[PDB]
Amino acid sequence: GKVIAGMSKIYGGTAPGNYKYIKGTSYTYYGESDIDRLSRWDIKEEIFSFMGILYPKLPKTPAGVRFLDDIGNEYTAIVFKTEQVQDYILINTDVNDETYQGWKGTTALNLFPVMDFERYRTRIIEKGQMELINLSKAEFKIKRKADFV
Amino acid sequence: TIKNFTFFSPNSTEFPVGSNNDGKLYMMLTGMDYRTIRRKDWSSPLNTALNVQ
């Protein structure tokens, strides 16, 4: 948010800086140092399946997405622990043709046995936010059902 | 009949060397049969999930 004189928390004007406690206008913080760290992958309505292209960072560290509910707790997580850095993990939650393949170069690797079976509790994603575990970049395609349209 | 391979061809057509002839030559030089190999990993193969690269 933009910095405003009298409204923001700053010691300005006549030396050695002055910030006033007013009623309603008082002092409101401008923003946060390095606000570029905050990124929310927002989930507003219940989603069923998705086709994400996961770009992993570190090898041998569980890489994959986890899902947070409205209170900041985890219900489901698709997490894989690979031996080498995959160029991208392709995950599809579609019931009919599930795909969990780690691509490296032109080679496609099946990631099903390497996946955490206990963390992956449900396919149905609820209202909250998605967190990226050991990922540099992410590209998602969300499919959400509607009974009558 | 005798088939010559490791000899010069005066008109560049006399003794062409076929891949199977070199195959046999190489097997004989190294002392290998069809039930073994010669193998060298110049760089280490890499294991990723249920795959070997």
Side-chain angles (χ1 to χ4, degrees), chain A residues 46 48 143-149:
Chain A
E46 184 199 275
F48 76 128
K143 52 220 273 176
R144 192 161 64 257
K145 216 191 98 285
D147 294 280
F148 184 91
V149 158

Side-chain angles (χ1 to χ4, degrees), chain A residues 63-79:
Chain A
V65 289
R66 75 183 200 120
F67 297 90
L68 293 184
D69 57 12
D70 48 339
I71 57 170
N73 274 305
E74 181 196 308
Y75 50 83
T76 192
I78 333 293
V79 89

Side-chain angles (χ1 to χ4, degrees), chain B:
Chain B
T1 50
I2 305 165
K3 282 273 180 179
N4 306 117
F5 299 93
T6 324
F7 299 89
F8 112 90
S9 297
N11 298 281
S12 310
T13 60
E14 293 85 350
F15 317 110
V17 9
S19 58
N20 58 324
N21 312 114
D22 267 1
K24 291 181 251 189
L25 160 74
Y26 299 153
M27 287 178 79
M28 291 166 75
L29 295 177
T30 200
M32 79 184 294
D33 60 15
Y34 292 103
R35 293 192 172 269
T36 197
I37 73 293
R38 294 298 175 260
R39 179 265 186 93
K40 174 66 183 178
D41 292 339
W42 303 103
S43 60
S44 294
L46 301 170
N47 306 318
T48 46
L50 298 172
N51 307 270
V52 58
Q53 179 182 69

Side-chain angles (χ1 to χ4, degrees), chain A residues 97-110:
Chain A
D97 81 339
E98 299 191 63
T99 291
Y100 304 103
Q101 64 190 23
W103 285 81
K104 194 185 182 75
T106 52
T107 327
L109 300 164
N110 173 44

